[PDB]
Structure 1
Amino acid sequence: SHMIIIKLGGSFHRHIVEQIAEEIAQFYPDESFILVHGGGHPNAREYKITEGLVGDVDRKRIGFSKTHQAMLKLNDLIIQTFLEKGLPAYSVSSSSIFLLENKEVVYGELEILRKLLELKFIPVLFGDTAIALDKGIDILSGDQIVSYLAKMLKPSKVIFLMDVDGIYDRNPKERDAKLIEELNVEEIRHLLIGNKLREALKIAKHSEVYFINGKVKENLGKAIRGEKVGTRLRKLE
């Protein structure tokens, strides 16, 4: 309905979080917002959590817990930044409501998020460690959380704040690239970032998708208002 999901990339830059909160404050509270950020990941690679519950099991469990705690610290920093700006952002543990199989959320709990949104709260989830029915433990990325929430909650739009202006033709590092302001299935179906494109193809069934540069503040508001900004992938037909 009148709900918007916002996903954040990677860097801790406090000023950019301040800008994101200030832009979100333009539509609170008559517009519902769910926030999702990413890594914590250093512990994810150091403990090879994606390897599963194989080999040294106890060390993998300890690293699972430590990575979750580091993600909680980063999430608390973001939460306090949002709270100082007068926004009631509430932390929701992703690993406490989600269960994966093959890097995909196959079990979820969403009544708590619904009651948070109803009471004019802003839930904030994170890419996190997670329990996986196949290989015991796994790393759940924020893109999968966004995909599941789009499957179930069906937001009005999903906005990805990236380090670059949006989806490009060539690699942004390889100059002479061009920006695609209007994205559709045929262009996304070019895979020779990729996982984000597959998740966007899955999400466009339910909601509009925006890819905008989070470094520019006003950008966020534009994507929420529907103005031309970055890359836009409309709802599929």
Structure 2
Amino acid sequence: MMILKIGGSVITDKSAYRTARTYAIRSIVKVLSGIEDLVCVVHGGGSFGHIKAMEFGLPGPKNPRSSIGYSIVHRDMENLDLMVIDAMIEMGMRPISVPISALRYDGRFDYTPLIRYIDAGFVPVSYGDVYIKDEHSYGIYSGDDIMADMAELLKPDVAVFLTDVDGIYSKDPKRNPDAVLLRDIDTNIGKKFESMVKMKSSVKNGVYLINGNHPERIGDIGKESFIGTVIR
């Protein structure tokens, strides 16, 4: 079994509100459709939740501004999600979105509906989303959070994160011409990296970070040729 997250940095233009990279969505999903053991797909939001979230005070205390922002951020995320769902349906996949915003929550989310779908043969699709954290607070659960939950619940053999760079580097490669790709990380981007390292305890054969602009690399896992990072 594989679980996989598509980063918002690769399927959206993060700098421009509600701006998708449709060709990246299509070319990633074309590859995802050939992965036989792919049981769950998560994606991030990029410019479809982070801009309105900041603008409306999410995550944060409930007030009439964040309450309206909650509606907008969730709606925007559905719009992005439907573009991923459309490409999956085109490739003959059997996707079904299960938003975090629709799950029971008591401090952790009741994912029973995603598990039921996996058992019935669907590929549940979920994404970084708003939720009601408590009677006076709205949270944002990111796609990395959801991936950590899914690792713990499913104990998949492999987890893949797609971002818009080749892997985890020593430093942000966009700022730092001298940054070096880290091919292999052991268990003994900072927030993302922490939770990936922590996922490895639930993922038998590796948590990978791969360039979503090179989705074909998912199939090079194991080969010399492989370009990417593995946490192992």
| TM-score normalised to structure 1 length | 0.84
- Tell me if the contact between 1:214 and 1:220 (Cα under 8 Å) persists in the aligned partners: no
Aligned match for 2:21, one of 10, 13, 29: 13
**Residue pairs, 1:43-192, within 5 angstroms:** 43-53=52-62, 57-97=63-103, 99=105, 106-133=107-134, 135-173=136-174, 174-186=176-188
Look up the match of 1:230.
228
Identity across matched positions, percent: 33
Give the partner amino acid of 2:80: L
- Tell me if the contact between 1:219 and 1:229 (Cα under 8 Å) persists in the aligned partners: yes
* Mapped partners of 1:107, 1:169: distance in 2: 33
Q: Which string of whole-angstrom CA distances, capped at 9 and with x for unpartnered residues, describes residues 54-98 of structure 1? A: xxx222212111211111111111111211121111111111126
* Mapped partners of 1:107, 1:27: distance in 2: 29
- Tell me if the contact between 2:60 and 2:137 (Cα under 8 Å) persists in the aligned partners: no
* Mapped partners of 2:90, 2:33: distance in 1: 12
Cα distance change, pair 120–62 in 1 and its aligned pair in 2 (3 A): same
Cα distance change, pair 135–149 in 1 and its aligned pair in 2 (3 A): farther
Q: Secondary structure, in 3 states, of the residue corresponding to 1:132? A: strand
* Mapped partners of 1:120, 1:129: distance in 2: 27
> What runs of 5+ residues in structure 2 fail to find an aligned partner?
13-19
- Is the counterpart of residue 27 in structure 1 residue 35 in structure 2? yes
* Mapped partners of 2:186, 2:118: distance in 1: 30
Q: Which runs of 4+ in 1 moved over 6 A?
A: none
- Tell me if the contact between 1:14 and 1:81 (Cα under 8 Å) persists in the aligned partners: no
Instruction: Please say which of residues 168-177 and 154-163 is displaced more in the overlay.
Output: 168-177
How far off is 1:220 after superposition?
2.3
Q: Secondary structure, in 3 states, of the residue corresponding to 2:218? A: helix
Q: What count of residue pairs does the alignment treat as equivalent?
A: 214
Cα distance change, pair 134–142 in 1 and its aligned pair in 2 (3 A): farther
Q: Which string of whole-angstrom CA distances, capped at 9 and with x for unpartnered residues, describes residues 38-57 of structure 1? A: 1122211110112222xxx2
How far off is 1:134 after superposition?
7.8
- Tell me if the contact between 1:99 and 1:133 (Cα under 8 Å) persists in the aligned partners: no
Task: Give me the CA root mean square deviation.
Answer: 1.8
> What runs of 5+ residues in structure 1 fail to find an aligned partner?
101-105, 187-192
Q: Which string of whole-angstrom CA distances, capped at 9 and with x for unpartnered residues, describes residues 113-168 of structure 1? A: 12211222111101000111385211111111111111222111110101100011
Give the partner amino acid of 2:195: E
* Mapped partners of 2:134, 2:160: distance in 1: 30
- Tell me if the contact between 1:98 and 1:130 (Cα under 8 Å) persists in the aligned partners: no
Give the partner amino acid of 1:167: I
Look up the match of 2:16.
none
| TM-score normalised to structure 2 length | 0.85
Look up the match of 1:198.
194
Q: Which string of whole-angstrom CA distances, capped at 9 and with x for unpartnered residues, describes residues 164-191 of structure 1? A: 00011132021122111111134xxxxx
Aligned match for 1:212, one of 195, 210, 214: 210
Give the partner amino acid of 1:13: R
Give the partner amino acid of 1:26: G
